[PDB]
Write a protein that binds this ligand. Structure first.
Ligand SMILES: Nc1ncnc2c1ncn2[C@@H]1O[C@H](COP(=O)(O)OP(=O)(O)OP(=O)(O)O)[C@@H](O)[C@H]1O
Ligand SMILES: Cn1c(=O)c(F)c(Nc2ccc(I)cc2F)c2c(=O)n(C[C@@H](O)CO)cnc21
Ligand SMILES: [Mg+2]
Length: 291
């Protein structure tokens, strides 16, 4: 069935970012619980019809690594996108509580992210454009899923003005110009894994002293660090060398030299992690407190 504003009822607010707020809602006619994301745009009706039009391709997104989609519409000045409610929230929220995320678990996260990007490229000819821990959602069934990928050109265009004035997961090439594509997602995945693995945004790297204890920056300063100074890496010894190599292959500054999805799919770390027996669902609930 078609979704519309009056058929919904707010339960609670799940969080907000730059340019969007997300509610946990009840869709009254079905009784289903959903996550309704609102993007406040005031923009000419002509193009906001185009946006809703372009967003309908998410009905063709069926994948165990992509958040389910229920529908998209326009309301009182707001674009609504209604997704599956992921009761374990995002990986940035999970890292927040967990402090630091185990390597074995990150292994399963990498598999989900890799297969996720693969589906999007294969079945839809699109890159993600915003891979970061807040955009990898998990739930009590143990499923790890991507959302907030860029399906609509007009939306991408209509949002270009804002962005994050700190912490960038953008690749060096994206920061420097318009010449980027799927490879740029590999960089963001790499950076996200390092963050989750260590427990804080990895730029700048920790001191020798900050490291042993473990185990603000200005905009141009941070960006200049991403572009010119050597990429971040996993501290030696306390992560397997397969995992270190894995992130190293993701964090190569040159997009063509950098590993791609097909190569990462067969990396020793993924191959090791595919075999591993991990109660992800159990680890999730036991850390963030669910059932
Ligand atoms: N489908 C969902 N199920 C459960 N929680 C969600 C869902 N989608 C988003 N959220 C939560 O809502 C919050 C806000 O999401 P939103 O995508 O607006 O911004 P963000 O991903 O936090 O950061 P940014 O705005 O910079 O992209 C996220 O932190 C996430 O925890
Ligand atoms: C271009 N684009 C999009 O095209 C887009 F679809 C987006 N959303 C989206 C995509 C897939 C699924 I499943 C659920 C979503 F909410 C999207 C998006 O969410 N964001 C994030 C901001 O709203 C921050 O709050 C940015 N661009 C999006
Ligand atoms: Mg987001």
């Amino acid at each position: 069935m078609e979704l519309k504003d009056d058929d919904f009822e707010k339960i609670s607010e799940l969080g907000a970012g730059n340019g969007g707020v997300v509610f946990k809602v009840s869709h009254k006619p079905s009784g289903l619980v959903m996550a309704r994301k609102l993007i406040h745009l005031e923009i000419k009706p002509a193009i906001r019809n185009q946006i809703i039009r372009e967003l309908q391709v998410l009905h063709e997104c069926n994948s165990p690594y992509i958040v389910g989609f229920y529908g998209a519409f326009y309301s009182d000045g707001e674009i609504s996108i209604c997704m599956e409610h992921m009761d374990g929230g995002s990986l940035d929220q999970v890292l927040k509580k967990a402090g630091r995320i185990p390597e074995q678990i990150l292994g399963k996260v990498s598999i989900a992210v890799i297969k996720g990007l693969t589906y999007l490229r294969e079945k839809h000819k699109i890159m993600h454009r915003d891979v970061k821990p807040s955009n990898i959602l998990v739930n009590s069934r143990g499923e790890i899923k991507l959302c907030d990928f860029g399906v609509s050109g007009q939306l991408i265009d209509s949002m270009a003005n804002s962005f994050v004035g700190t912490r960038s997961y953008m690749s060096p090439e994206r920061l420097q110009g318009t010449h980027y594509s799927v490879q740029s997602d590999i960089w963001s995945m790499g950076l996200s894994l390092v963050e989750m693995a260590v427990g804080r945004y990895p730029i700048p790297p920790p001191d020798a002293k900050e490291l042993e204890l473990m185990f603000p920056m200005a905009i141009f300063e941070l960006l200049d660090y991403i572009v010119n100074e050597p990429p971040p890496k996993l501290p030696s010894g306390v992560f397997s060398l397969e995992f270190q190599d894995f992130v190293n292959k993701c964090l190569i500054k040159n997009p063509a030299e950098r590993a791609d999805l097909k190569q990462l799919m067969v990396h020793a770390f993924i191959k090791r992690s595919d075999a591993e027996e991990v109660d992800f669902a159990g680890w999730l609930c036991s850390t963030i407190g669910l059932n």
